[PDB]
Swiss-Prot record:
This is Band 4.1-like protein 3. One of its GO terms (cellular component) is postsynapse. Residues 4-284 form the FERM domain. Keywords: Acetylation, Actin-binding, Apoptosis, Cell junction, Cell membrane, Cytoplasm, Cytoskeleton, Membrane, Phosphoprotein, Tumor suppressor. The lineage of its organism: Eukaryota, Metazoa, Chordata, Craniata, Vertebrata. The gene is EPB41L3. It comes from Homo sapiens.
């Protein structure tokens, strides 16, 4: 029975290698990765791969791996798929740990914009979780952490991480990670998956997919929000993506809203992640 080697980049930046039967469904690989990670609260996570256009795609756990990666390498990343709006309601510390690791990459990558002070506060909790209590002997006036905190590091930021780290004496790792999450969850771009699009007039917008619905950034700022409950039907056709909105009170008709995506595969990807968010955050 023939097996294909899988390589998975984990959220700590390390590479997990395993073998699955070549006709395996995505769930098979995901189950192996989650067992490796000692992860029980698996519903929030997924694997990604890069298609022939180099676009990130979720690996569908219900479909054959070979029919998704097609002509590409069996190489994946382990990622948060559904960002919980209240991470304190997760049952296990280790789930919150993996969510912290994802958010640290969201921040360094610039997907999750963050004020100077919030960058320093998040960094101070990460340092407290990983090294424990502040030790002066390790850090002098010229200290620069190995930890990546931000898309652009400054000496001022490193200084502010140290100043806040000093305030966290006695804090345990789960405690520090919970504080990390209480701050991160409030950020306006927390768990927002952004897709480039044009409105029905050709004006460049971003569509953000998240727990609280579909966001339209008509400028660079959120100019419209469609909460999932209002959305009855999501669909795509050629390069276009549509949402069917519930009739408002006393309104005769539903309303269908249409957008232009970069190509047909980008419309399909946006449709799939919207359907998946709608389902997940309907049940949560
Ligand atoms: C940051 C982790 C990641 O890769 N997320 C992801 C992956 C794929 C898509 S999709 N299928 O293009 O909508 C959206 C978001």
């Amino acid at each position: 029975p023939k097996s294909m080697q899988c390589k998975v980049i984990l959220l700590d930046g390390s590479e997990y290698t395993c073998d699955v039967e070549k006709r395996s469904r995505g769930q098979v690989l995901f189950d192996k990765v989650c067992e490796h990670l000692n992860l029980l609260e698996k519903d929030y996570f997924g694997l990604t791969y890069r298609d022939a256009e180099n676009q990130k795609n979720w690996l569908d756990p219900a479909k054959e791996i070979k029919k998704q990666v097609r002509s590409g390498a069996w190489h994946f990343s382990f990622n948060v798929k559904f960002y919980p709006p209240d991470p304190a309601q997760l049952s296990e510390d280790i789930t919150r740990y993996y969510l912290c690791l994802q958010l640290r990459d969201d921040i360094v990558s610039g997907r999750l914009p963050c004020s100077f002070v919030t960058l320093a506060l998040l960094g101070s909790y990460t340092v407290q979780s990983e090294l424990g209590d502040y030790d002066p002997d390790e850090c002098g006036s010229d200290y620069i952490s190995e930890f990546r905190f931000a898309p652009n590091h400054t000496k001022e930021l490193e200084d502010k991480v140290i100043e806040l780290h000093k305030s966290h004496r006695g804090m345990t790792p789960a405690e520090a990670e919970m504080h990390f999450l209480e701050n991160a969850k409030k950020l306006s771009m927390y768990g927002v998956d952004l897709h480039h699009a044009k409105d029905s007039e050709g004006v460049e917008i971003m569509l953000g997919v998240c727990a609280s619905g579909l966001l339209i950034y008509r400028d660079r700022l959120r100019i419209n929000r469609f909460a999932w409950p209002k959305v009855l039907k999501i669909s795509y056709k050629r390069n276009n993506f549509y949402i069917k909105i519930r009739p408002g009170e006393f309104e005769q008709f539903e309303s269908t809203i249409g957008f232009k995506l970069p190509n047909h595969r980008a419309a399909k990807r946006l449709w799939k992640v919207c359907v998946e968010h709608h389902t997940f955050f309907r049940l949560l």
